[PDB]
Amino acid sequence: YGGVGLGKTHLMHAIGHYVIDHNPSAKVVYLSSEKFTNEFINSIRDNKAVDFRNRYRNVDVLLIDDIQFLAGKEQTQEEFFHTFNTLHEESKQIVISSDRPPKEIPTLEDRLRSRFEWGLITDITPPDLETRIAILRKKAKAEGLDIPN
Partner DNA sequence: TAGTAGAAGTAATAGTAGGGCCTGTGGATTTGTGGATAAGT
Three-class secondary structure of residue 89 per DSSP: helix
For residue 69, the surrounding DSSP H or E stretch is: none
| For helices 33-45 and 74-89, angle between their N-to-C axes, nearest 10 degrees | 100
77-98 per-residue burial string, b: 16 or more CB within 10 A, e: under 16: bebbeebbeebeeeebebbbbb
Extract the runs of DSSP E, i.e. beta strands, from the chain.
28-32, 61-65, 93-96
Q: Is 32 in the site for Mg ion (CB under 5 A)?
A: no
125 is in an annotated binding site: no
Nearer to ligand ATP, 111 or 138 (CB): 138
The minimum distance between CB 67 and DNA, in angstroms, equals 13
Nearer to ligand ATP, 20 or 95 (CB): 95
Q: Is 44 in the site for DNA (CB under 7 A)?
A: yes
Nearer to DNA, 28 or 77 (CB): 77
9 is in an annotated binding site: yes
Parallel, antiparallel, or unpaired for β 28-32 and 93-96? unpaired
Q: Is 66 in the site for ligand ATP (CB under 6 A)?
A: yes
Nearer to DNA, 34 or 104 (CB): 34
Q: Is 4 in the site for ligand ATP (CB under 6 A)?
A: yes
Q: Is 6 in the site for ligand ATP (CB under 6 A)?
A: yes
Q: By the criterion CB under 7 A, which residues form the site for DNA? A: 34, 37-38, 40-41, 44, 47, 49, 73-79, 82
